[PDB]
UniProtKB/Swiss-Prot annotation, chain C:
It is linked to Mitochondrial complex III deficiency, nuclear type 5: A disorder of the mitochondrial respiratory chain resulting in a highly variable phenotype depending on which tissues are affected. Clinical features include mitochondrial encephalopathy, psychomotor retardation, ataxia, severe failure to thrive, liver dysfunction, renal tubulopathy, muscle weakness and exercise intolerance. Component of the ubiquinol-cytochrome c oxidoreductase, a multisubunit transmembrane complex that is part of the mitochondrial electron transport chain which drives oxidative phosphorylation. The chain holds residues 152 to 302 of 453 of the full protein. This is Cytochrome b-c1 complex subunit 2, mitochondrial. Belongs to the peptidase M16 family. UQCRC2/QCR2 subfamily. The gene is UQCRC2. The lineage of its organism: Eukaryota, Metazoa, Chordata, Craniata, Vertebrata. It comes from Homo sapiens. It is found in: Mitochondrion inner membrane. It comes from the Eukaryota.
From Swiss-Prot, chain D:
Component of the ubiquinol-cytochrome c oxidoreductase (cytochrome b-c1 complex, complex III, CIII). Subunit 9 corresponds to the mitochondrial targeting sequence (MTS) of Rieske protein UQCRFS1. It is retained after processing and incorporated inside complex III, where it remains bound to the complex and localizes between the 2 core subunits UQCRC1/QCR1 and UQCRC2/QCR2. Component of the ubiquinol-cytochrome c oxidoreductase (cytochrome b-c1 complex, complex III, CIII). UQCRFS1 undergoes proteolytic processing once it is incorporated in the complex III dimer. One of the fragments, called subunit 9, corresponds to its mitochondrial targeting sequence (MTS). The proteolytic processing is necessary for the correct insertion of UQCRFS1 in the complex III dimer, but the persistence of UQCRFS1-derived fragments may prevent newly imported UQCRFS1 to be processed and assembled into complex III and is detrimental for the complex III structure and function. The chain holds residues 1 to 48 of 274 of the full protein. It comes from Homo sapiens. This is Cytochrome b-c1 complex subunit 9. The lineage of its organism: Eukaryota, Metazoa, Chordata, Craniata, Vertebrata. It comes from the Eukaryota.
Length: 419, 55, 151, 48
């Protein structure tokens, strides 16, 4: 029946703890860095950085780090988005001290030696290739590239022309301007609060202050079309949406679940979705449709993602688009909204159920203000979404300037100006 | 309520020194498997999946 | 099949000069269907061109009415009878194309080169029209072509 | 005048059993040598 403790230190570092009884402890360091802070001169730096988590440090060599973590049996991982980065370690309660020391060294004492960086470059290409096997990866990065001018467009993977051209100087420059105390948050689960304070005191004698800041992500209604020999076309067309934290963001979340954000029944037909039940009666069964919602600090994106056949690519899109228009025209019943809300609550509480996702959630909202937001309050806000708000969101999407990113045969896919 | 997990959407790679890169959100290919979709990824410079770390 | 790999060599030599890549993108950015087709084979099609497609294109596009023959040193009467042989080949008309529609899109590339190239085109007149001549005069007024060297 | 070989429009890829293939057109180029330093490095593809 324990609760969490929060403290904000003079430097700016945020600490968090939630004493549990699981025999496994997990600690995470969340940094407000990402690809949104790079520029055209240093593109591809973050991708290389997230692969350097096992390089030699001032206080520990690469050999020591790898062997030590393996002998203890713990795990080290790095998770990166376009706005945040996170280091995470998991181990047993009795070995927490050593792993915290390694995490201190890696995030605080990086060397970035020349020959090591040169060797890592091959890895980058392999890492980018395995991720691009899934077509959605390429499609969505192009979508960002076709939706913004300056920020939130920088790819999450190193461009091919920058491989082998990343230097230790860029790594050091990025670390010193972004890995700052007032930009970090340390979260612990199996550890007690006072020991976190102790290790934090070791974190409060480095870096410090604030860091270089980026610029507002301007919106450009672009299109990027790619041609290949695949039999299936992946298309995504999107419009701007206000984000984050506003009740309008909640309205968009409810809206996407009205339109069938995802599947519930294994091998089901998704009879409760307005999109799948329109495409199904329009063309053959092989297809897929869903709503797409992305939230970022200064902007948000809401749209529709579809996978269909090359010949049927056109009609499919039309049908999906039509469905949204009916919602914006005032056609709605207060019985699917309740179902949509239930879907949202279930997804949230069931996603946070795992300890790993719970740690990620706490770290994510610890940076905006540091005040934890219990799920009960989240549910309260969700239940407060009216009906006119959802219609308002639909009208904004229809009237908004659209973007698009298609990848496939694109022989019958429509252009953005024909939608 | 701000995380990608809480708002399904763009991929969040979890590449690690000791585990694979299986990650992401709002990946609408698993629902398409049931409807006719013989297409499956080829094994060109590919890795295993399910990241069997906690066996 | 043996000739297929040559496609890469030819394509690479042409792209050595960045101007080729800018225009082939420019045509793909201003036209929707017809003239957007690249002069060079796309990368994914390099290994998958078949002889049946070659045959099909030949029959439907090598029609006699579509052809013309020109000679400079040869005499006209002999040209008639040498050409008489293929009068039993092809014939009629071929497969017509589609009128090129205009879109107006952009295609940026973001390569590592220091010297940036660009292009700023807009709809013009049709080949062999009075308006087409005005555009020809217009570009030469704007210094289209250099005349004096090192100047 | 109906041939683009005498214009600054599209390129004209050529091939020959004995001669080499070189494109044409008249869009700005060449006159950048005087003001600039555009190097001509040899690369994977080599042709005279």
């Amino acid at each position: 029946p324990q609760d969490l403790e929060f403290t904000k230190l003079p430097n700016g570092l945020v600490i968090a703890s939630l004493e549990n009884y699981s025999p496994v402890s997990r600690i995470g360091l969340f940094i407000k860095a990402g690809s949104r802070y790079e520029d055209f001169s240093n593109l591809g730096t973050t991708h290389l950085l997230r692969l350097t988590s096992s390089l030699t440090t001032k206080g520990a060599s690469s050999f020591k780090i790898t062997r030590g973590i393996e002998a203890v049996g713990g795990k080290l991982s790095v998770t990166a988005t376009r706005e945040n980065m996170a280091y995470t370690v998991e181990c047993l309660r009795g070995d927490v001290d050593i792993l915290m020391e390694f995490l201190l060294n890696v995030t605080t004492a990086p060397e970035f030696r020349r020959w090591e960086v040169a060797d890592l470059q091959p890895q980058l290409k392999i890492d980018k290739a395995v991720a691009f096997q899934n077509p959605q990866t390429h499609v969505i990065e192009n979508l960002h590239a076709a939706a913004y001018r300056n920020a939130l467009a920088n790819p999450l993977y190193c461009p091919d022309y920058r491989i082998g051209k990343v230097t230790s100087e860029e790594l050091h420059y990025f670390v010193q301007n972004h890995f700052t105390s007032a930009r970090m948050a340390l979260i612990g689960l199996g550890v007690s609060h006072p020991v976190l304070k102790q290790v934090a005191e070791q974190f409060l004698n480095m870096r410090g202050g604030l860091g270089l800041s980026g610029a507002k992500a301007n919106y450009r209604g672009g299109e990027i079309r790619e041609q290949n020999g695949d039999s299936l076309v992946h298309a995504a067309f999107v419009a701007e949406s206000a984000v984050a934290g506003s009740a309008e963001a909640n309205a968009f979340s409810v809206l996407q679940h009205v339109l069938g954000a995802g599947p519930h029944v294994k091998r089901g037909s998704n009879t409760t979705s307005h999109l799948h039940q329109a495409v199904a009666k329009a063309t053959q069964q092989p297809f897929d449709v869903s709503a797409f919602n992305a939230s970022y600090s200064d902007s948000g994106l809401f749209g529709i993602y579809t996978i269909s056949q090359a010949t049927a690519a056109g009609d499919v899109i039309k049908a999906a688009y039509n469905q949204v228009k009916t919602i914006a025209q005032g056609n709605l019943s207060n019985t699917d909204v309740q179902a949509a809300k239930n879907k949202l609550k279930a997804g949230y509480l069931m996603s946070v159920e795992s300890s790993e996702c719970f740690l990620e959630e706490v770290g994510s909202q610890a940076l905006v203000a540091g005040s934890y937001m219990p799920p009960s309050t989240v549910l309260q806000q969700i239940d407060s979404v009216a009906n006119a708000d959802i219609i308002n969101a639909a009208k904004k999407f229809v009237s908004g300037q659209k973007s698009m990113a298609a990848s496939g045969n694109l022989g019958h896919t429509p252009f953005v100006d024909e939608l | 309520m701000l995380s990608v997990a809480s708002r399904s959407g763009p991929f969040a790679p979890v590449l690690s020194a000791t585990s694979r890169g299986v990650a992401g959100a709002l990946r609408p290919l698993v629902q398409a498997t049931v409807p006719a979709t013989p297409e499956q990824p080829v094994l060109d410079l590919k890795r295993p999946f399910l990241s069997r770390e906690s066996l």
